[PDB]
Design a protein around this ligand. Sequence first.
Ligand SMILES: Nc1nc2c(ncn2[C@@H]2O[C@H](COP(=O)(O)OP(=O)(O)NP(=O)(O)O)[C@@H](O)[C@H]2O)c(=O)[nH]1
Ligand SMILES: [Mg+2]
Length: 166
Amino acid sequence: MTEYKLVVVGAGGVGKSALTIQLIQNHFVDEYDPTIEDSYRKQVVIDGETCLLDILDTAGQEEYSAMRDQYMRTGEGFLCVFAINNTKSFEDIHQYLEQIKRVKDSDDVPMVLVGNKCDLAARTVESRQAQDLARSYGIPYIETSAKTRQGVEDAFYTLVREIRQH
Ligand SMILES: Nc1nc2c(ncn2[C@@H]2O[C@H](COP(=O)(O)OP(=O)(O)NP(=O)(O)O)[C@@H](O)[C@H]2O)c(=O)[nH]1
Ligand SMILES: [Mg+2]
């Protein structure tokens, strides 16, 4: 069956793992557990077709700039995550978008910009700011909360649809 090679990228602590674990395992990882590199494979049905999600959950670590080019080369779609209560994570996601485009030699890579932790009150990134960034890359912006599950399936399934209809 069709496989979708999804890669979840972004700064440390934005919720890359919590989002993936919510999607695959249906619960919220409410603990400190930094990632090295984890892979999740799951058969799902999206819009009436069986497919395999192969999800690579990456490290936010800025020192892993070597494994980073490699997964960017092989990935098909990227969920580019920042946290809406962490302005520095929003500025960091710019560098991920640019690196993907450099490594893939393409301005047309399936991507979704994800503003995570939308359940938290202390928002410092306004939605319009993130919409403008997404629009400059021609990609959707979707807000999520790995805690409440708001937007989680929307974000991942939108990324699949961006690939599928590419
Ligand atoms: N309130 C709230 N907390 C969240 C959300 N997503 C993640 N968190 C919390 O934020 C922290 C970091 O989450 P985690 O998924 O490990 O982040 P990560 O991006 O995978 N970090 P790393 O790059 O080190 O692997 C954890 O305490 C987690 O419970 C969310 O949507 N809402
Ligand atoms: Mg992680």
